[PDB]
Design a protein around this nucleic acid. Structure first.
Lengths: 103, 97, 95, 78, 93, 105, 97, 83
DNA sequence: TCAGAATCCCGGTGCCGAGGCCGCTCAATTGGTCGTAGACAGCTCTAGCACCGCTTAAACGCACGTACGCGCTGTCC
DNA sequence: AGCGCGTACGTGCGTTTAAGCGGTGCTAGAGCTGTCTACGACCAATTGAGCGGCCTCGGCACCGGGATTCTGA
């Protein structure tokens, strides 16, 4: 393969086929799919870290879409990468404007 | 007894922010979908997943909208959202003219 | 039936690397699959911008490196540049 | 089918949206708002259907149409 | 050295449109930028369209639907009618 | 006629639009009607702005279209005002717009 | 003597600056701000004089829009005077950070 | 020569002229400072991307084009400078 | 209300550097060629969906029941 | 800040139809195979397009004057 030789789980050949057959350029230089697969794997781990932490804090073994949305909105840079983005079955952060009380 | 007006709304906000369930009844939504689509093309089928996707985007858009809305109300010092807030909201987003 | 692809298995593998004793739902699996394809498209579209903007008919690891600094926020970009470079470091050394 | 978007469904959406108090004109406003929104997505979605030579408007037809207009929903083959 | 520009075609069009009217180098500039943006918008959505249909080839079909996705409704009608006339005239000519 | 433009009824270069659809990495293969249709669309959209801009030049007592006239040429149409909403024109500025509560009573 | 009233000349200034399109920040100070920002991102940069006027055109168009939207926030808050809070709401709503 | 405080070279009348083009009748004194803030955040965004295109181009001259690319990334497409 | 000056508007003349249209050179665009595989076509099998219907069981709707908000009217700073 | 008008709220009871189970219509969603048009690649040709040119015209600049109208008495 190429994944064990790069130190990756993610499929380098799948990523490279999409770089050529996605029409992004004439030619694609063979470090590109390994550097890209590593970034996709890193970002995958960065979501799953905070989503696994959320699943544990929500007392669950299985990651549901709630845990993905909460992980993405708990972190500024995930929310900045994912600002226009929205998640199926995700909900919102708990937030009430502090003027709203029984009084 | 009687809960003071506004007390249970706070309770309900907590309930709905905590939950990720869909808030529009899916058959009334789906019938309005097929109407709006009909307007575009006749004799159209829709995947169940296709409807959901419209559903999820529509519900999430309105919540964020209401988010932003409620802000425009409190910017006028109001608690009550009014059509002017939405209007200003959209306006600023540059959706509406 | 269609032999429809997904990143399912590798996302699972990576979940084990961060949280060994944790699992994932189908609903969540999709959103992770979705996230990968969208980020792939946003980075490859920027690498295609770098290719056009620099005449060269080619996307290299450098076009990816810059596309990653363009797309990602600063600390996320720093980490991604480190992992991208580290993966290439083992890889180009191997045959 | 506009009144099928129920007054309590709008109350639920507004309460999730952090709203304690809803003015009476909001319910019809939210319906006009939502109609416009669905209009926009269904228009571009159909367009992809039209282009696909299909009678089933697909999920992908909707996902492309959302993803054109900002509003990037993940989960439906993203 | 050869810096390519839509300056001459924009002049011809402007002269059909307002024969007694010139264009400043800034005005021009702007218009030439708009040409490349409209080209990139339509070719990008036609490429999406291609892609989305497991299709190897951008045809005026693509370009047509892409113009319908991109342009607002009255602007779309006139863009479409110039498109459909021009292809029909080209291949028969 | 030799030029693809003439065969099409266009001023816009069907050859260069062809070259660019190939150089720009959109698909493997390019059709032959794709250029012609796109060149007519570019020629239309440019003629639309140039019409409204020559009119705006006349509204400024000017014989030369300057960017002030191009901004009017976008903003005087409800629809070009949408297409070029999130776009800035160098020296286009803003239309005169003063809010009704600010004016003296 | 003569003195125009508070808020008479203010609209004469709006009328003046909306009739014209020339930029409203000085060129040498704006270029020094671009040098100053750019130096902290990368030392020993060079700038095409056209590039800086781009940045200025882009920035003044940005802020006029902003102001635009800020004035609406003050008006919606029943105010003739813009304040940081209007700006703040505007940006929030625009999705700015 | 070192560079310092050139943000205050964005002047009170320059900020006022812009708010007047923006249709503003009355300016609270606290706006002027806020404005600078926003503008710094603004220019930092665009210049970081333009410099990132200049860096990738193996150049040190930030070009009209690099500016123009950055804006278009930021959804602020600009005509008059190329592209 | 008349009275004045202030800034706006305008008319001119006046001076010139930016653009209108021409030119002449070279690589881009075109005149007619190939080889090849895309796509059309058009037929196949068959999820997946259509939308109708039903029994159920919550949610919708309505009137109710009273409190706290909207927002004008005033005044000071 | 005060002063006045009346709207959203929360709560009991009365009224509707969505959830979701269920199904056959008849498909058309998606698959796959052999043909030929069409496009990429090509060759060789002279045009089409661009930058060098050159001159003033349409613009912008300076200055006097009338026009508008705000604000002072």
């Amino acid at each position: 393969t190429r994944s064990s030789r790069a130190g990756l789980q993610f499929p380098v050949g799948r990523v490279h086929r999409l770089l050529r057959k996605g029409n992004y350029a004439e030619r694609v230089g063979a470090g590109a799919p390994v550097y890209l697969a590593a970034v996709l794997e890193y970002l995958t781990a960065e979501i799953l870290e905070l989503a696994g932490n959320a699943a544990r804090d929500n007392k669950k073994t299985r990651i549901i879409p709630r845990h993905l949305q909460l992980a993405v909105r708990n972190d500024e840079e995930l929310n900045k990468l994912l600002g226009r983005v929205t998640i199926a079955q995700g909900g919102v952060l708990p937030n009430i404007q502090s003027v709203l009380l029984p009084k | 007894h009687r809960y003071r007006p506004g007390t249970v709304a706070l309770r309900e906000i907590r309930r709905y922010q905590k939950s990720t369930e869909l808030l529009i009844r899916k058959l009334p939504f789906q019938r309005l979908v097929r109407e709006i689509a009909q307007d575009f093309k006749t004799d159209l089928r829709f995947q169940s997943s296709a409807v959901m996707a419209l559903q999820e985007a529509s519900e999430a858009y309105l919540v964020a909208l209401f988010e932003d809305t409620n802000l425009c109300a409190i910017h006028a010092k109001r608690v009550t959202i009014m059509p002017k807030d939405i209007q200003l909201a959209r306006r600023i987003r540059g959706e509406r003219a | 039936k269609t032999r429809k692809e997904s990143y399912a298995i590798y996302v699972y593998k990576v979940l084990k690397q961060v949280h060994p004793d944790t699992g994932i739902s189908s609903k969540a699996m999709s959103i992770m699959n979705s996230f990968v394809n969208d980020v792939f498209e946003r980075i490859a579209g920027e690498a295609s911008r770098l290719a056009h903007y620099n005449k060269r008919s080619t996307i290299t690891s450098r076009e990816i490196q810059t596309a990653v600094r363009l797309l990602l926020p600063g600390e996320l970009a720093k980490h991604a540049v480190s992992e991208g470079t580290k993966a290439v470091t083992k890889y180009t050394s191997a045959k | 089918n506009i009144q099928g978007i129920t007054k309590p469904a709008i109350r639920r959406l507004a309460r999730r949206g952090g709203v304690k108090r809803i003015s009476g004109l909001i319910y019809e406003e939210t319906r006009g708002v939502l109609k416009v929104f669905l209009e926009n997505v269904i228009r571009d979605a159909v367009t992809y259907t039209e282009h696909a030579k299909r009678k089933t408007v697909t999920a992908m037809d909707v996902v492309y149409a959302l993803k054109r207009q900002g509003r990037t929903l993940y989960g439906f083959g993203g």
